[PDB]
Design a protein around this ligand. Structure first.
Ligand code: 2GO
Ligand code: CLA
Ligand code: CLA
Ligand code: CLA
Ligand SMILES: CC(C)CCCCCCCCCCCC(=O)OC[C@H](OC[C@H](C[N+](C)(C)C)C(=O)O)OC(=O)CCCCCCCCCCCC(C)C
Ligand SMILES: CC(C)CCCCCCCCCCCC(=O)OC[C@H](OC[C@H](C[N+](C)(C)C)C(=O)O)OC(=O)CCCCCCCCCCCC(C)C
Ligand SMILES: CNCCOP(=O)(O)O[C@H](COC(=O)CCCCCCCCCCCC(C)C)OC(=O)CCCCCCCCCCCC(C)C
Ligand SMILES: CNCCOP(=O)(O)O[C@H](COC(=O)CCCCCCCCCCCC(C)C)OC(=O)CCCCCCCCCCCC(C)C
Ligand SMILES: CNCCOP(=O)(O)O[C@H](COC(=O)CCCCCCCCCCCC(C)C)OC(=O)CCCCCCCCCCCC(C)C
Ligand SMILES: CC(C)CCCCCCCCCCCC(=O)OC[C@@H](OC(=O)CCCCCCCCCCCC(C)C)OP(=O)(O)OCCN
Ligand code: HEC
Ligand code: HEC
Ligand SMILES: [Ca+2]
Lengths: 38, 35, 145, 854, 193, 35, 48, 35
């Protein structure tokens, strides 16, 4: 029975999540965007 | 200078994700139990 | 459902020799100890005359590269057989008291870091997987008492 | 139920008076025995250790006293039959033993006399009392009934048996006596002034420590007669641990001059109140002892808290405790590491405990007086502003809700930062984020010539990046000397010899030529990773401490800064010259380069010596707030910032139930909405209606405050004792803490394990550990929603046992009924068990010794 | 619990030692009893029993912060190290009883799983003194702060680790009842350290 | 003396701070009841 | 003792049942509350 | 096999032993109501 307000919060937390993942797994498995490589 | 700014951004995101997640647990608790 | 498998990653191993899985080799005791003996001895000479041509020459290429980084072989401090040298204080791996009072995990960092004055550090010479193999070979030197 | 409710307020003045006097006499007797247990024939224990630094500062305990005595007051003093000074003539006694003996006997004689006199006021109140009711288990002895039926303390008797001839204070016609508690406020503080004078005269003339500015030019020491300013600590003013002359108000002669300063002030404020005693309408209801009891007990609690803070700072580095570290302190056969700081920490944490317990209890006793006003219909009539200011329920919900919010935000900030940096120190990969550790690599001196293989990116700033290993012109992987690292380089974790971070491969250089603001005087390449070192600055106390400190030390700070700047330039030019050497290619060009670093070596040496010595000086400047184990400046740490946020947030978490006691003892907004009213101050619930209602009463709110406060109280214990509170997993021996000159014993969880290595060395400490753990978890049997189960099952047990008794013939078993705790008495004993279980274990953390580096 | 502790052993004097120096042992600034009735017996007695280097040490003096405290640079002079058995015993038993008993036992034969056992001859013969320093300084095994054998390079000084090294060689060939005594240290030192 | 006064004042300012906060909330929400 | 008055050292082989040895001659610091170990059984070989 | 059989037999024996006690009590207290 979710609100728009809540959906939107959920989208915003999905973004942080994926932004984080991209930074963690993209340089490692492609050897590019080398500022986030570890 | 630039490390510091980068670190502040990660910490913000963590607070947005953990507090944000906790309140979603409450909302979800609320929808199940009632309204 | 959860572990759809389990995402633990791919295993780190040593160098690849064509036609013979290195990852597999790193869990098969008779393969890993053959590479440990090569490192330990600094030559391919004490390897079973049954060794294949490709194997015998891959080992040599491994040694030749390590010889350019001033790698010092384990035998001959510690000898080809253990139980080193009292002169140099080089550890005797045949001794049971030395073997009981070491864990294999603990032994690892003493090879990585070196140990007091003379036993050299191997962290910049060898990979942590090649140190694991050597800890396993040193285990087989033990004698009773 | 009522067994702990025997004596409830209001009481009459003579009965309170008399019991306080009797308790005072009783304490004086216990202290007298503690004086006997201080004598030098005994082992060190916790009781005699917590008094020895004070008895050293007083001159009564003398550490350098070796001679044995044989005649001192009267001709019978080596040793003799039936002791000669009973049970003590067995051992060699010194003069400090005799000084101790005498002060013991003096405290037992005064105490017994005060106990007698208190009893005279207490029982002569009631017109007397018979010997068998005073002592009460004296009529059980047979052939001594007649003895116990005499009447002592009678209003009538001959001089050695009077109590109160007039019956009460109110009836006795001495027209000096004040007649109301506000009028008595003036004599009570003149009286306390007089006590301050007594102490000052005892210190000046009995203990021989006159007041500043009248201290002697000369004082006797074990090495002869010396001048006050060179005589070491117990004798004179020279502090032999810090190597300084003490400030005059940091000696005991300072404390004797304050005896007179405070005594004059109390006498004059008491004479002022004699003439204009307090009279406000806002105060008049406070004559009822139930109401004042709240005020006084909560104030006293605050006083204890302030004793803890004041005593901790004032005495952290004082020679009375450090002197303990020089004696050869052995407890249950061990040998303690830094006993000075251990006993100092015990005394201050003792006081913090007492602080909490009395603020919480004082407020509960407050809520009892208000609840009774509500029961009796008088709350609505009350006239004092100190009640009526808070009568509005809409204001009460705004008070409670905004302190809940302020608590929420400070505790989320602190606990969230702890969680973050423990993630960072552990290198945890979450899929969406890789946490990264702090790592450092020295770039200067000899270390700066060790090489590594470097993966070096092409252009960090643009994506569709790429990198490559650093090579030679022929194509082999070249070794990069730590002096030549750059920001963005990656060095393999395995080649730095790091396991423990298996989810990634490289460490990244994030800053080069880094010099700690406060730490080692070295130059590093660093990975900052996720480690928030800037968080130390998110502390108002960092800035105040460092500002005052900079203002006081500004010239050596300026010369240090300038010596650092000169060394950095000289190191940078050395690295140029070393690089020209390494990249020569012509045996001539090599040789000439080598010639020029050789003639620049001296003066790199000089810039490094200069920098080292200025840094050593700067780090020897006196502390303001944050200190070393010496008494030198340290910069604030992440530890100190987290402590700061945790004190704000965690004391609000603990004290919110006290506000609820204050406002909602009778009706809260939940209650008012249903029209309910709390009928007593201690009911457990009213049952399952509306979901469940356990735990709303003011006695229960009292228990919640105490449990919740366990949390700020453990943060204080961990901080006092040298734990790191800013993460959970921190180890003392790691790169961040050694490069920044930080000593700690732990990391929240990691402290628990690490200190217990020390606890395990002591068999008496481990037996305490086992027991205190048994006490705590049994509290769960009493706090869980479980009491019906327990009563139902205890009924099954009763039945079985009575069956056995009928079958077996055992008359005493045939009517057995096991008692099962009802709900209120369970919550009380469960809280008692939970609290004593935890704080016997916290005692152990202090008692293993103090292990922070000095 | 309180008061009825025992009588103190007459051999443990309370007569006071000199205070720990404020100056760092690693300072480049300026470098590194009476006749009263029983004061000479008490000083002579403190000179054997009361330890001088038991207290945690200044932070600039810890082995990781000392320029000559790394395993590669420390001086293990055998003449200074095995010079005085009183001293090895006075110091190493206090340090060992405090820091090392927890994991290695009250007998020094091993408590924590896989922990060392210092009485074992085979272990004694195959370790150098410099080797023993390395493992105290580095720790043993992989982990944060050392492994299951924790690192001491923040924590202890080079001089404190050296008393530990000499004390540990008194464990050789002893039985599993507590720690080496004063005469174990002395027979160890006579048989060439 | 300096550290003692600082600590004490920092605790006293902790209470004074809170009251001010609470006073701001009360004044700026006068005429909103909280039901 | 000896006939000469000084403490005889008893060799472990000649320990008898009843004998007390000082805890601190054996190095034991963990039991500071009693003083001696008592020999309660000699020539004992563990069944297992 | 011998070890497996011994362990299983001991678990079933604990059950059987409890049954025998609990039935030595029932049989010899049959004239007395528990209460
Ligand atoms: C570590 C070695 C050893 C082992 C064998 C051990 C095990 C266990 C077990 C188990 C089966 O393994 C259990 C179940 C257990 C139980 C207990 N132990 Zn325990 N225990 C040991 C040793 C000890 C010791 C010495 C102590 C406890 C103490 C305690 C206590 C804990 C009492 C309690 O409830 O305490 C809450 C407080 C805690 C956890 C301390 C928090 C410290 C921290 C620095 C506070 C600051 C930061 C926080 C994140 C909070 C911030 C927000 C806030 C301020 C509002 C009970 C009996 C106890 C204690 O922590 O009391 C506060 C104590 O002193 N224990 N303990
Ligand atoms: C801090 C949180 C944390 C993190 C970062 C990890 C990470 C890991 N876990 Mg642990 N785990 C945790 C907490 C964590 N876990 C908790 C609370 C439990 C109890 C439920 C476990 C129980 C556990 C088991 C039993 C195992 C791991 C394994 C793993 C690994 C592979 C995980 C994976 O495939 O995920 C993807 C999978 C999901 C997201 C769910 C499917 C990895 C090292 C595996 C491993 O072998 O590592 C050594 C493994 O077997 N996890
Ligand atoms: C020390 C641990 C402890 C012990 C010994 C008990 C004992 C018991 N509980 Mg309690 N309980 C505990 C903790 C413990 N509990 C905890 C932690 C909780 C919360 C979950 C509970 C919650 C609880 C519930 C809800 C109920 C019980 C019940 C019971 C009884 C079970 C009936 C029975 O089978 O007799 C068999 C008896 C035993 C197996 C116990 C033998 C006794 C012990 C080990 C000796 C005790 C030593 C004591 C700590 C030392 C102090 C003595 C001092 C003088 C030396 C039993 C007497 C039931 C009951 O019937 O209530 C009457 C019940 O309904 N327990
Ligand atoms: C297993 C139980 C046990 C044993 C055998 C001891 C033994 C002792 N305690 Mg410890 N103690 C214990 C549990 C124990 N305690 C518990 C549960 C606590 C927590 C309340 C304490 C708290 C404690 C303190 C605070 C002190 C000790 C002290 C002592 C010693 C003097 C005892 C004494 O005076 O007794 C006579 C006691 C009575 C007759 C009861 C009064 C003795 C070594 C003293 C000491 O210094 O130790 C080295 C000491 O200061 N006890
Ligand atoms: C228990 C659960 C509830 C979760 C708890 C753990 C949660 C971890 C904390 C996660 C924090 C989120 C990280 C967000 C973030 O900014 O970090 C990722 C970021 O990535 C940047 C780039 C951006 N492009 C490429 C899109 C332009 C990316 O990867 O996509 O790199 C950083 O922020 C790194 C910061 C540098 C540190 C110095
Ligand atoms: C605080 C300590 C320092 C000890 C305090 C003094 C006593 C120490 C020694 C233990 C004393 C045990 C006495 C137990 C006893 O006899 O209880 C009887 C009792 O009451 C019933 C009648 C009185 N009606 C009820 C008639 C008025 C009576 O006997 O006086 O009880 C209770 O109801 C409480 C329960 C006591 C526990 C006894 C249970 C014993 C276990 C037996 C189980 C198994 C059977 C088969 C043996
Ligand atoms: C290993 N050694 C660590 C300490 O080293 P070192 O010597 O460098 O430094 C002082 C800190 O030690 C203290 O001095 C603690 C004493 C604890 C007893 C004292 C602990 C009591 C603390 C607070 C008590 C609150 C009570 C009264 C509610 O480091 C300080 O700066 C502490 C200053 C404390 C002030 C914080 C202000 C916060 C405001 C609180 C608001 C609360 C309310 C609104 C409800
Ligand atoms: C069986 N009768 C019912 C058990 O009543 P409950 O459920 O009420 O719960 C106890 C409560 O404690 C307290 O409310 C403190 C009171 C005393 C103050 C305590 C004061 C401290 C005492 C220590 C002081 C002495 C020392 C210092 C010497 O706690 C527990 O849950 C722990 C379990 C205790 C074990 C019970 C004993 C077994 C008896 C049953 C026999 C069954 C069969 C054979 C048929
Ligand atoms: C009857 N229905 C009506 C209401 O009942 P109601 O809840 O009032 O009643 C009782 C009694 O008040 C106590 O609570 C007595 C202890 C007070 C001083 C205490 C007096 C003796 C104990 C303490 C003193 C001992 C020392 C000082 C000698 O019912 C209970 O609490 C029954 C539970 C206790 C039964 C024993 C359970 C275990 C025994 C303790 C072991 C636990 C340990 C592991 C800690
Ligand atoms: C255990 C406990 C129960 C006992 C508590 C101990 C009490 C000790 C009292 C602490 C005494 C401190 C004075 C020593 C000192 O402050 O030293 C010199 C200080 O000079 C002064 O200002 C002298 C004036 C002191 C007049 C104040 C009286 C205090 C009142 C106590 C009230 C207690 C309550 C009611 C809780 O120097 P600076 O700050 O200038 O320099 C920095 C030092 N590096
Ligand atoms: C130049 C001599 C030398 C070479 C080459 C040498 N070692 Fe050692 N090693 C020593 C000496 C000396 C010690 C004794 C260390 C000490 O002081 O305790 C020792 C110690 C050891 C120990 C025991 C460590 C422990 O913790 O207890 C191991 C395992 C070991 N070496 C393995 C190796 C391996 C594997 C190599 C080759 C990869 C190797 N060594 C190469 C001389 C050498
Ligand atoms: C936390 C437990 C713990 C503490 C505390 C501890 N140790 Fe150990 N120690 C171990 C374990 C486990 C080993 C076995 C390491 C291995 O082989 O895995 C060990 C091994 C050693 C070794 C042998 C090292 C080698 O290479 O052969 C020495 C020497 C040592 N410890 C000395 C000490 C001394 C001295 C102290 C106190 C300073 C101390 N230990 C404290 C657990 C600990
Ligand atoms: Ca401690």
């Amino acid at each position: 029975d979710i609100s728009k307000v809540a959906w939107a919060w959920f989208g915003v937390l999905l973004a942080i999540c994926l932004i984080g993942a991209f930074g963690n797994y993209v340089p490692k498995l492609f050897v590019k965007m080398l500022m986030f490589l570890n | 200078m630039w490390n510091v700014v980068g670190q502040i951004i990660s910490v913000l995101c963590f607070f947005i994700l953990t507090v944000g997640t906790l309140f979603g647990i409450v909302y979800v608790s609320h929808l199940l139990s009632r309204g | 459902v959860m572990a759809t498998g389990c995402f633990v990653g791919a295993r780190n191993a040593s160098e690849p020799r064509l036609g013979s899985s290195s990852i597999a080799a790193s869990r098969t005791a008779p393969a890993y100890l053959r590479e440990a003996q090569v490192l330990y001895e600094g030559s391919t000479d004490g390897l079973p005359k049954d060794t294949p041509a490709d194997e015998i020459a891959h080992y040599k290429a491994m040694l030749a590269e390590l010889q350019t980084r001033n790698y010092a072989a384990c035998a001959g401090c510690h000898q080809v057989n253990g139980g080193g040298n009292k002169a140099i204080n080089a550890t005797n791996f045949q001794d049971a008291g030395w073997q009981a009072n070491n864990s294999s995990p603990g032994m690892v960092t003493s090879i990585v870091n070196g140990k007091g004055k003379v036993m050299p550090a191997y962290k910049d010479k060898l990979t942590l997987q090649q140190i694991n193999y050597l800890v396993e070979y040193i285990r087989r030197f033990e004698k009773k008492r | 139920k009522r067994w702990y409710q025997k004596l409830e307020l209001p009481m009459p003045p003579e009965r309170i008076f008399g019991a306080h006097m009797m308790l005072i006499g009783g304490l004086a007797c216990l202290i007298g025995t503690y004086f006997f247990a201080s004598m030098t024939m005994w082992n060190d224990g916790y009781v005699n250790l917590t008094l020895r630094p004070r008895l050293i500062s007083l001159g009564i305990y003398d550490p350098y006293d070796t001679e044995q005595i044989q005649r001192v007051w009267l001709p019978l003093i080596g040793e003799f039959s039936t002791s000669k000074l009973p049970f003590f003539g067995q051992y060699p006694l010194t003069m400090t033993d005799f000084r101790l003996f005498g002060w013991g006997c003096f405290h037992i004689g005064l105490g017994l006399w005060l106990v007698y006199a208190g009893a005279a006021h207490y029982y002569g109140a009631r017109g007397g009392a018979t010997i068998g009711e005073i002592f009460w288990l004296l009529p059980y002895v047979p052939g001594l009934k007649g003895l116990c039926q005499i009447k002592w303390f009678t209003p009538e008797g001959p001089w050695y048996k009077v109590g109160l001839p007039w019956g009460s204070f109110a009836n006795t016609p001495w027209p000096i006596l004040r007649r109301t508690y506000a009028d008595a406020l003036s004599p009570h503080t003149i009286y306390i002034g007089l006590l301050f004078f007594i102490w000052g005269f005892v210190l000046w003339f009995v203990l021989d420590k006159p007041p500043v500015p009248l201290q002697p030019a000369q004082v006797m020491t074990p090495n002869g007669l010396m001048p006050l300013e060179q005589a070491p600590f117990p004798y004179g003013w020279f502090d032999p641990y810090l190597n300084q002359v003490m400030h005059p108000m940091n000696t005991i002669n300072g404390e004797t001059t304050m005896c007179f300063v405070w005594g004059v002030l109390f006498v004059a404020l008491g004479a002022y109140w004699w003439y204009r005693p307090p009279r406000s309408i806002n105060i008049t209801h406070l004559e009822d002892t139930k109401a004042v009891f709240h005020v006084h007990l909560t104030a006293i609690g605050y006083v204890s808290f302030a004793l803890a803070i004041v005593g901790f700072l004032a005495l952290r580095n004082h020679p009375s405790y450090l002197m303990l570290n020089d004696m050869n302190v052995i407890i249950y056969g061990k040998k303690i590491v830094n006993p000075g700081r251990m006993i100092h920490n015990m005394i201050t944490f003792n006081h913090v405990q007492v602080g909490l317990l009395y603020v919480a209890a004082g407020v509960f006793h407050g809520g009892q007086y208000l609840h009774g006003l509500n029961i009796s219909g008088a709350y609505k009539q009350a006239r004092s502003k100190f009640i009526t200011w808070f009568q509005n329920p809409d204001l009460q919900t705004k008070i409670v809700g905004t302190t809940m919010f302020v608590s929420f935000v400070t505790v989320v900030f602190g606990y969230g930062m702890i969680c973050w940096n423990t993630g960072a120190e552990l290198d945890l990969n979450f899929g969406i984020y890789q946490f990264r550790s702090f790592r450092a690599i020295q770039m200067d001196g000899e270390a700066g010539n060790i090489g590594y293989r470097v993966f070096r990116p092409k252009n960090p700033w643009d994506p569709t990046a790429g990198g490559d290993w650093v090579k030679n012109p022929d194509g082999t992987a070249k070794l990069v000397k730590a002096r030549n690292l750059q920001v963005g380089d990656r060095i393999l974790n395995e080649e730095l010899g790091i396991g423990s971070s298996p989810t990634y491969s490289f460490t990244t250089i994030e800053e080069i030529n880094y010099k700690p603001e406060w730490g080692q005087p070295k130059l590093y390449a660093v990975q900052w990773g996720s480690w928030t070192h800037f968080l130390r600055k998110v502390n108002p106390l960092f800035w105040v401490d460092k500002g005052i400190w900079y203002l006081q030390n500004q010239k050596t700070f300026e010369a240090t800064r300038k010596a650092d700047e000169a060394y950095l330039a000289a190191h940078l030019k050395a690295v140029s010259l070393l690089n020209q050497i390494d990249d020569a290619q012509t045996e001539e060009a090599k040789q000439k380069a080598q010639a020029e670093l050789d003639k620049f070596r001296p003066e790199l040496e000089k810039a490094h010596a200069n920098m080292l010595e200025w840094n050593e000086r700067l780090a020897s400047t006196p502390a303001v707030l944050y200190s070393n184990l010496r008494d030198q400046h340290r910069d604030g740490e992440i530890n100190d910032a987290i402590f700061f946020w945790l004190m704000i947030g965690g004391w609000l978490f603990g004290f919110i139930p006290l506000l609820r006691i204050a406002f909602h003892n009778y009706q809260s907004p939940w209650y008012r909405d249903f029209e309910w009213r709390k009928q007593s101050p201690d009911f457990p619930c009213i049952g399952p209606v509306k979901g469940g209602t356990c735990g709303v009463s003011i006695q229960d709110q009292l228990w919640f405050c105490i449990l919740f406060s366990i949390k700020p109280l453990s943060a204080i214990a961990w901080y006092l004792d040298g734990g790191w509170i800013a993460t959970m997993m921190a180890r003392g021996n790691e790169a961040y803490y050694l490069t920044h000159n930080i000593s700690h014993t732990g990391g929240v969880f990691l402290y628990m394990w690490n200190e217990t290595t020390w606890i395990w060395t002591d068999n008496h400490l481990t037996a305490m550990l086992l027991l205190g753990h048994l006490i705590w978890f049994v509290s769960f049997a009493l706090w869980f929603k479980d009491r019906g189960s327990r009563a139902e099952g205890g009924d099954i047990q009763s039945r079985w046992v009575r069956l056995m008794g009928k079958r077996l013939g055992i008359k005493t078993l045939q009517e057995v009924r096991f008692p099962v705790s009802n709900l209120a008495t369970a919550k009380l004993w469960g809280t008692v068990f939970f609290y004593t279980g935890t704080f016997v274990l916290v005692f152990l953390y202090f008692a293993d010794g103090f292990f922070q580096n000095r | 619990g309180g008061c009825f502790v025992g009588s103190r052993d007459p051999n443990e004097t309370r007569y006071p030692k000199a205070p720990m120096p404020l100056q760092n042992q690693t300072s480049t600034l300026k470098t590194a009893a009476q006749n009263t009735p029983g004061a000479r017996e008490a000083a002579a007695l403190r000179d054997r029993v009361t330890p001088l280097n038991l207290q945690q040490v200044n932070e600039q003096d810890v082995a990781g912060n000392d320029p000559l405290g790394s395993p590669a640079r420390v001086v293990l002079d055998e003449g200074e190290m095995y010079r005085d058995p009183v001293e090895i015993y006075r110091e190493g038993r206090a340090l060992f009883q405090n820091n090392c008993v927890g994991c290695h036992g009250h007998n020094g034969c091993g408590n924590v799983p896989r922990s060392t056992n210092f009485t074992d001859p085979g272990w004694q013969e195959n370790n150098s003194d410099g080797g023993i320093y390395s493992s105290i300084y580095n720790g043993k095994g992989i982990g944060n702060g050392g492994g299951a054998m924790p690192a001491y390079y923040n924590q202890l000084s080079p001089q404190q680790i050296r008393y530990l090294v000499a004390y540990l060689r008194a464990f050789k060939g002893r039985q599993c009842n507590g720690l080496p005594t004063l005469s174990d240290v002395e027979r160890m030192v006579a048989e060439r350290q | 003396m300096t550290a003692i006064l600082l600590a004490c004042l920092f605790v006293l300012g902790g209470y004074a701070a809170l009251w001010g906060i609470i006073k701001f909330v009360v004044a700026n929400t006068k005429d909103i009841a909280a039901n």
